[PDB]
Amino acid sequence: HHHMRRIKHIHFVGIGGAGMCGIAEVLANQGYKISGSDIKASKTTQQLEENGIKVYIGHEAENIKNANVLVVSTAIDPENPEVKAAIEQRIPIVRRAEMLGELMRYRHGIAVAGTHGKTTTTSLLTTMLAEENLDPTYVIGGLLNSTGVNAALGESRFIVAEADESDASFLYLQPMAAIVTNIDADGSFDKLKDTFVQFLHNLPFYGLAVVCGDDANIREILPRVGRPVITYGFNEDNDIRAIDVEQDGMRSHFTVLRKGREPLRLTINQPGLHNVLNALAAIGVATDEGVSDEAISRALKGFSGVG
Ligand SMILES: Nc1ncnc2c1ncn2[C@@H]1O[C@H](COP(=O)(O)OP(=O)(O)NP(=O)(O)O)[C@@H](O)[C@H]1O
Ligand SMILES: [Mg+2]
Ligand SMILES: [Mg+2]
């Protein structure tokens, strides 16, 4: 991937906050100098230090020394001393989602959205690409148990990332493929559906959206999407269907049907009908990306979960 013009030192304000340390880890593995700051030392900050990322405790204006850009979680608060010093010194400040957007530039990015099941689905799809030997970069909002990290840099073109709908963060992403697991109510619910539509409009006109056709709210916004859509679910009118579902204690067995493919029997190593649906979402993108049946089966059968 190309260098970012004149960016050598990136400083994360609130690096112990959610979503921040995974981006910092990927950028660090790419060769950027990564520093950060946070209110209180934590298991996240103690660890970031262990991989060479200096993590100041307490926000002092001097913590942004030598930084070329600052990363904040969502909004820019001028009352924060590091933020205020950066504005005084004309240092750029971007939100986390915009920095994640830049990791997708020049990559084949897959953004996993939905109200529930993003972390699980992102993990499943990442494992499927790993099993196909496609070494993906990934950014998960949780510990991938198979690797022991939230996020890692891969050498392939792929990056799989959680796409957060809160604060409309995911509109800063420019993916080549997207998942929407569900759109659940519990601003207004109508604005929220609009933003999911906007998110999919960020796909290129030829990009793929894999969405759960069992969800009535997803079904409602499909006429507005204007991109290639593949629906998954249990219902009969889905492009991708799990049938013959058997809940077997901590494991589930099902058959996935896919247009132009022979029926495929699978076992997912996690309980719950929602995780069969999450696996269908990952299967959808993985199939389109060329992942073999064997890689999909191995990934699902032995799935170590997300911490
Ligand atoms: N498809 C689903 N539909 C509804 N609930 C689900 C689904 N998948 C998982 N869950 C539930 O959501 C909980 C958290 O799952 P997770 O995969 O971390 O979701 P997320 O979309 O990443 N959530 P958040 O990042 O907190 O907005 C799970 O432990 C389940 O209780
Ligand atoms: Mg949430
Ligand atoms: Mg999550």
Short mmCIF file of C-alpha atoms and ligand atoms in Angstrom, two decimals:
data_model
loop_
_atom_site.label_atom_id
_atom_site.label_comp_id
_atom_site.label_asym_id
_atom_site.label_seq_id
_atom_site.Cartn_x
_atom_site.Cartn_y
_atom_site.Cartn_z
CA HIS A 1 0.00 0.00 0.00
CA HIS A 2 1.16 3.56 -0.72
CA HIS A 3 2.66 5.78 2.02
CA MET A 4 0.42 8.60 3.24
CA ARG A 5 1.90 11.91 2.03
CA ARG A 6 4.16 13.25 4.80
CA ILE A 7 2.63 11.10 7.59
CA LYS A 8 5.23 9.37 9.77
CA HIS A 9 3.93 9.78 13.35
CA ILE A 10 0.25 9.15 14.17
CA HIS A 11 -1.05 9.94 17.68
CA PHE A 12 -4.25 8.37 19.07
CA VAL A 13 -6.15 10.42 21.67
CA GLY A 14 -7.95 7.94 23.88
CA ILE A 15 -6.13 4.94 22.42
CA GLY A 16 -7.63 2.65 25.07
CA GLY A 17 -11.06 3.55 23.72
CA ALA A 18 -13.04 1.12 21.62
CA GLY A 19 -11.88 0.57 18.05
CA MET A 20 -8.72 2.62 18.50
CA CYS A 21 -6.02 0.11 19.37
CA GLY A 22 -6.76 -2.18 16.41
CA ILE A 23 -6.21 0.65 13.91
CA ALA A 24 -3.10 1.71 15.83
CA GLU A 25 -1.79 -1.87 15.73
CA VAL A 26 -2.30 -2.20 11.96
CA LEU A 27 -0.67 1.18 11.27
CA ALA A 28 2.24 0.22 13.54
CA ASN A 29 2.74 -3.07 11.66
CA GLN A 30 2.84 -1.02 8.45
CA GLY A 31 5.82 1.01 9.69
CA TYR A 32 4.20 4.17 11.04
CA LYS A 33 5.37 5.58 14.35
CA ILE A 34 2.33 5.17 16.63
CA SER A 35 1.80 6.93 19.94
CA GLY A 36 -1.29 7.41 22.05
CA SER A 37 -2.80 8.75 25.24
CA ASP A 38 -5.59 7.83 27.61
CA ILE A 39 -7.28 8.84 30.85
CA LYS A 40 -6.28 5.76 32.84
CA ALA A 41 -3.75 2.99 32.35
CA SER A 42 -5.40 -0.31 31.47
CA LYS A 43 -4.74 -3.78 30.12
CA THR A 44 -5.08 -2.19 26.69
CA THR A 45 -2.48 0.51 27.42
CA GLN A 46 -0.06 -1.77 29.28
CA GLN A 47 -0.15 -4.10 26.25
CA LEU A 48 0.18 -1.40 23.57
CA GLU A 49 3.34 -0.41 25.43
CA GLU A 50 4.57 -4.01 25.18
CA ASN A 51 4.53 -3.75 21.36
CA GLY A 52 6.45 -0.47 21.34
CA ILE A 53 3.58 2.05 21.22
CA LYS A 54 4.18 4.82 23.77
CA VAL A 55 0.95 5.49 25.68
CA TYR A 56 0.87 8.66 27.79
CA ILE A 57 -1.50 8.70 30.77
CA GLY A 58 -3.34 11.96 31.26
CA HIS A 59 -3.87 14.47 28.45
CA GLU A 60 -1.06 17.02 28.36
CA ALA A 61 -0.49 19.23 25.33
CA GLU A 62 3.08 17.94 25.07
CA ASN A 63 1.89 14.37 24.36
CA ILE A 64 1.40 15.25 20.67
CA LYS A 65 5.10 16.02 20.15
CA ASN A 66 6.23 15.17 16.58
CA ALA A 67 2.79 13.89 15.56
CA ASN A 68 1.75 14.53 11.96
CA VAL A 69 -1.93 13.69 12.53
CA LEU A 70 -4.22 12.99 15.49
CA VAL A 71 -6.96 10.35 15.76
CA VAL A 72 -10.00 10.87 17.97
CA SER A 73 -12.78 8.37 18.50
CA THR A 74 -15.76 10.36 17.17
CA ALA A 75 -15.96 14.12 17.80
CA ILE A 76 -13.22 16.75 18.08
CA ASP A 77 -13.30 18.24 21.59
CA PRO A 78 -11.23 21.47 21.70
CA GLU A 79 -11.27 21.31 25.53
CA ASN A 80 -8.94 18.26 25.38
CA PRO A 81 -5.37 19.59 25.75
CA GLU A 82 -3.91 17.30 23.10
CA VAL A 83 -6.69 18.27 20.66
CA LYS A 84 -6.30 21.96 21.52
CA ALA A 85 -2.51 21.87 21.07
CA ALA A 86 -3.00 20.15 17.70
CA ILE A 87 -5.40 22.87 16.51
CA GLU A 88 -2.98 25.60 17.68
CA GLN A 89 -0.14 23.90 15.80
CA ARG A 90 -2.25 23.20 12.67
CA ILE A 91 -1.96 19.39 13.00
CA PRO A 92 -4.78 17.51 11.22
CA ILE A 93 -7.31 15.65 13.35
CA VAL A 94 -9.36 12.78 11.94
CA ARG A 95 -11.93 10.53 13.53
CA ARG A 96 -11.26 6.83 13.93
CA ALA A 97 -13.61 5.85 11.10
CA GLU A 98 -11.83 8.11 8.66
CA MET A 99 -8.47 6.53 9.52
CA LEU A 100 -10.10 3.11 9.07
CA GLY A 101 -11.37 4.38 5.70
CA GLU A 102 -7.77 5.12 4.72
CA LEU A 103 -6.74 1.54 5.55
CA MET A 104 -9.37 0.46 2.99
CA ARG A 105 -8.01 2.77 0.28
CA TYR A 106 -5.90 0.73 -2.18
CA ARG A 107 -7.20 -2.47 -0.59
CA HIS A 108 -10.19 -4.70 -1.31
CA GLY A 109 -12.23 -3.70 1.73
CA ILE A 110 -15.16 -5.59 3.26
CA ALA A 111 -17.23 -3.58 5.76
CA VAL A 112 -19.42 -5.65 8.10
CA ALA A 113 -22.39 -3.63 9.38
CA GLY A 114 -25.62 -4.28 11.20
CA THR A 115 -26.96 -3.61 14.67
CA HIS A 116 -25.97 -7.02 16.11
CA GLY A 117 -23.45 -9.69 15.16
CA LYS A 118 -20.82 -7.48 13.46
CA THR A 119 -17.87 -8.72 15.57
CA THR A 120 -18.88 -12.38 15.21
CA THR A 121 -19.50 -12.09 11.47
CA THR A 122 -16.27 -10.18 10.83
CA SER A 123 -14.41 -12.90 12.74
CA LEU A 124 -16.06 -15.72 10.77
CA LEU A 125 -15.38 -14.10 7.40
CA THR A 126 -11.78 -13.32 8.40
CA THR A 127 -11.27 -16.95 9.40
CA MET A 128 -12.69 -18.11 6.05
CA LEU A 129 -10.18 -15.97 4.12
CA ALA A 130 -7.37 -17.16 6.41
CA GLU A 131 -8.35 -20.78 5.74
CA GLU A 132 -8.13 -20.08 2.00
CA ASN A 133 -4.55 -18.83 2.59
CA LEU A 134 -5.57 -15.29 1.62
CA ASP A 135 -3.81 -13.63 4.63
CA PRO A 136 -6.30 -10.79 5.26
CA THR A 137 -5.76 -7.63 7.19
CA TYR A 138 -8.52 -7.43 9.75
CA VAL A 139 -9.89 -4.98 12.33
CA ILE A 140 -12.34 -6.55 14.77
CA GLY A 141 -14.04 -4.95 17.74
CA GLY A 142 -12.99 -7.86 19.92
CA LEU A 143 -10.28 -10.43 20.52
CA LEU A 144 -10.00 -13.03 17.74
CA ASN A 145 -9.31 -16.13 19.87
CA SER A 146 -7.35 -17.91 17.10
CA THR A 147 -4.74 -15.10 16.86
CA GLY A 148 -4.90 -13.31 20.23
CA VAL A 149 -5.34 -9.82 18.74
CA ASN A 150 -8.18 -7.50 17.75
CA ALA A 151 -6.49 -6.68 14.48
CA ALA A 152 -3.53 -7.51 12.30
CA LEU A 153 -1.87 -6.53 9.04
CA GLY A 154 -1.94 -9.11 6.25
CA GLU A 155 -0.02 -9.09 2.99
CA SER A 156 -3.02 -9.67 0.68
CA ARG A 157 -5.39 -7.15 -0.89
CA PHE A 158 -8.16 -8.02 1.60
CA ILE A 159 -9.13 -6.10 4.73
CA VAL A 160 -12.18 -7.11 6.78
CA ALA A 161 -13.45 -4.57 9.31
CA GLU A 162 -16.40 -3.88 11.56
CA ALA A 163 -18.53 -1.01 10.23
CA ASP A 164 -20.06 0.98 13.12
CA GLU A 165 -23.42 2.65 12.39
CA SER A 166 -23.37 4.72 15.57
CA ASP A 167 -22.51 8.37 14.90
CA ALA A 168 -22.72 7.36 11.20
CA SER A 169 -19.01 6.38 11.46
CA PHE A 170 -19.34 3.81 8.70
CA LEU A 171 -20.07 6.49 6.07
CA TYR A 172 -16.32 7.21 6.17
CA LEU A 173 -15.63 3.69 4.79
CA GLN A 174 -15.13 3.01 1.07
CA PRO A 175 -15.53 -0.77 0.83
CA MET A 176 -15.64 -3.03 -2.21
CA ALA A 177 -18.13 -5.36 -0.48
CA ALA A 178 -20.41 -4.95 2.50
CA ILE A 179 -22.54 -6.96 4.90
CA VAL A 180 -25.66 -5.79 6.71
CA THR A 181 -26.61 -8.40 9.34
CA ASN A 182 -29.81 -6.67 10.62
CA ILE A 183 -31.34 -3.25 11.33
CA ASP A 184 -32.94 -3.39 14.77
CA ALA A 185 -34.72 -0.56 16.60
CA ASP A 186 -34.14 -1.44 20.28
CA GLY A 187 -32.32 10.40 16.33
CA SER A 188 -35.20 8.45 14.77
CA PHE A 189 -35.42 4.96 13.29
CA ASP A 190 -36.11 6.46 9.88
CA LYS A 191 -32.87 8.47 9.82
CA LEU A 192 -31.10 5.29 10.92
CA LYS A 193 -32.42 3.35 7.95
CA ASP A 194 -31.38 6.24 5.66
CA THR A 195 -27.83 5.97 6.97
CA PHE A 196 -27.72 2.24 6.20
CA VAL A 197 -28.80 3.14 2.65
CA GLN A 198 -26.07 5.79 2.46
CA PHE A 199 -23.53 3.26 3.71
CA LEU A 200 -24.31 0.84 0.86
CA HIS A 201 -24.26 3.69 -1.67
CA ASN A 202 -20.55 4.00 -0.79
CA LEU A 203 -20.02 0.68 -2.57
CA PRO A 204 -18.86 1.01 -6.18
CA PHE A 205 -21.69 0.43 -8.62
CA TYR A 206 -20.34 -3.12 -9.19
CA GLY A 207 -19.73 -3.88 -5.49
CA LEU A 208 -21.61 -6.57 -3.59
CA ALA A 209 -23.93 -6.09 -0.61
CA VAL A 210 -24.74 -9.25 1.40
CA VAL A 211 -27.73 -8.62 3.66
CA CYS A 212 -30.16 -10.64 5.76
CA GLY A 213 -33.44 -11.00 3.84
CA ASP A 214 -35.22 -12.33 6.95
CA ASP A 215 -35.04 -8.79 8.41
CA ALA A 216 -38.15 -6.79 7.46
CA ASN A 217 -36.32 -3.47 7.82
CA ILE A 218 -33.62 -4.65 5.42
CA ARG A 219 -36.31 -5.89 3.00
CA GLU A 220 -37.88 -2.43 3.16
CA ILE A 221 -34.75 -0.52 2.07
CA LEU A 222 -33.63 -2.94 -0.68
CA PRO A 223 -35.41 -0.98 -3.49
CA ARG A 224 -33.25 2.01 -2.49
CA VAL A 225 -29.85 0.29 -2.64
CA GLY A 226 -29.02 0.30 -6.36
CA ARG A 227 -26.09 -2.12 -6.01
CA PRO A 228 -25.79 -5.90 -6.50
CA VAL A 229 -27.52 -7.51 -3.52
CA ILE A 230 -27.43 -11.11 -2.30
CA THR A 231 -29.90 -11.91 0.49
CA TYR A 232 -29.35 -14.64 3.09
CA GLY A 233 -31.54 -16.19 5.76
CA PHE A 234 -33.86 -19.05 6.68
CA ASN A 235 -36.79 -17.83 4.58
CA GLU A 236 -37.54 -19.44 1.23
CA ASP A 237 -37.04 -16.28 -0.88
CA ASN A 238 -33.36 -15.72 0.05
CA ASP A 239 -30.54 -16.02 -2.48
CA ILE A 240 -28.61 -17.92 0.22
CA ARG A 241 -30.57 -20.25 2.47
CA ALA A 242 -29.79 -22.36 5.51
CA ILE A 243 -32.08 -25.40 5.61
CA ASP A 244 -32.22 -28.58 7.72
CA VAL A 245 -30.89 -26.65 10.70
CA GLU A 246 -30.02 -28.79 13.74
CA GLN A 247 -29.08 -27.21 17.06
CA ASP A 248 -26.69 -29.71 18.67
CA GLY A 249 -25.78 -28.29 22.06
CA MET A 250 -22.82 -25.97 21.60
CA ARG A 251 -22.69 -26.65 17.82
CA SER A 252 -25.10 -26.20 14.92
CA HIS A 253 -25.44 -28.18 11.70
CA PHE A 254 -27.10 -26.78 8.60
CA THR A 255 -27.18 -26.97 4.80
CA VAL A 256 -26.42 -23.82 2.78
CA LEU A 257 -27.91 -23.43 -0.69
CA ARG A 258 -26.32 -21.06 -3.20
CA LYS A 259 -27.27 -20.20 -6.78
CA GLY A 260 -25.36 -22.42 -9.18
CA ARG A 261 -23.75 -24.53 -6.42
CA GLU A 262 -24.47 -27.94 -4.99
CA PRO A 263 -26.00 -27.99 -1.48
CA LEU A 264 -23.34 -27.85 1.23
CA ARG A 265 -23.56 -29.34 4.72
CA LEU A 266 -21.75 -27.36 7.41
CA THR A 267 -21.16 -27.26 11.16
CA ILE A 268 -20.53 -24.01 13.03
CA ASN A 269 -18.75 -24.35 16.40
CA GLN A 270 -21.05 -21.87 18.20
CA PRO A 271 -24.60 -22.12 19.55
CA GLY A 272 -27.62 -20.08 18.54
CA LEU A 273 -29.68 -19.53 15.40
CA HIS A 274 -28.29 -15.97 15.09
CA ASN A 275 -24.79 -17.40 14.58
CA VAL A 276 -26.04 -19.64 11.76
CA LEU A 277 -27.28 -16.40 10.18
CA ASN A 278 -23.96 -14.67 10.84
CA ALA A 279 -22.19 -17.60 9.16
CA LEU A 280 -24.46 -17.18 6.11
CA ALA A 281 -23.40 -13.52 5.84
CA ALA A 282 -19.73 -14.53 5.85
CA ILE A 283 -20.45 -17.40 3.44
CA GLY A 284 -22.02 -14.90 1.04
CA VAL A 285 -18.98 -12.65 0.78
CA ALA A 286 -16.55 -15.57 0.88
CA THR A 287 -18.31 -17.39 -1.96
CA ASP A 288 -18.26 -14.26 -4.11
CA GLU A 289 -14.56 -13.79 -3.30
CA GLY A 290 -13.75 -17.34 -4.47
CA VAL A 291 -13.26 -19.15 -1.14
CA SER A 292 -13.54 -22.91 -1.51
CA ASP A 293 -16.07 -25.11 0.28
CA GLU A 294 -13.23 -26.73 2.25
CA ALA A 295 -11.98 -23.40 3.59
CA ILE A 296 -15.53 -22.38 4.55
CA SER A 297 -16.15 -25.70 6.33
CA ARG A 298 -12.83 -25.71 8.23
CA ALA A 299 -13.31 -22.10 9.34
CA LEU A 300 -16.81 -22.74 10.68
CA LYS A 301 -16.21 -26.19 12.16
CA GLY A 302 -13.32 -25.13 14.35
CA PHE A 303 -14.25 -21.53 15.07
CA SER A 304 -12.49 -20.53 18.33
CA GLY A 305 -14.83 -17.58 18.99
CA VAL A 306 -14.31 -13.93 19.89
CA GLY A 307 -13.26 -12.73 23.35
N1 LIG B 1 -27.47 -11.79 14.02
C1 LIG B 1 -27.73 -11.38 15.29
N2 LIG B 1 -28.92 -10.82 15.57
C2 LIG B 1 -29.18 -10.42 16.82
N3 LIG B 1 -28.37 -10.52 17.87
C3 LIG B 1 -27.18 -11.08 17.60
C4 LIG B 1 -26.81 -11.54 16.34
N4 LIG B 1 -25.53 -12.08 16.41
C5 LIG B 1 -25.13 -11.95 17.65
N5 LIG B 1 -26.14 -11.34 18.41
C6 LIG B 1 -26.14 -11.00 19.81
O1 LIG B 1 -25.34 -9.78 19.95
C7 LIG B 1 -24.35 -9.99 21.01
C8 LIG B 1 -23.02 -9.27 20.68
O2 LIG B 1 -22.56 -9.78 19.41
P1 LIG B 1 -21.43 -9.06 18.38
O3 LIG B 1 -21.10 -10.07 17.24
O4 LIG B 1 -20.25 -8.57 19.30
O5 LIG B 1 -22.27 -7.81 17.84
P2 LIG B 1 -21.91 -6.28 17.24
O6 LIG B 1 -22.88 -6.12 15.99
O7 LIG B 1 -20.40 -6.35 16.88
N6 LIG B 1 -22.27 -5.37 18.55
P3 LIG B 1 -21.66 -3.77 19.14
O8 LIG B 1 -20.24 -3.82 18.47
O9 LIG B 1 -21.69 -3.86 20.71
O10 LIG B 1 -22.58 -2.70 18.45
C9 LIG B 1 -24.10 -11.46 20.87
O11 LIG B 1 -23.42 -11.98 22.04
C10 LIG B 1 -25.54 -11.97 20.82
O12 LIG B 1 -26.12 -11.94 22.13
MG MG B 2 -23.47 -0.88 18.88
MG MG B 3 -18.87 -5.32 17.83
#
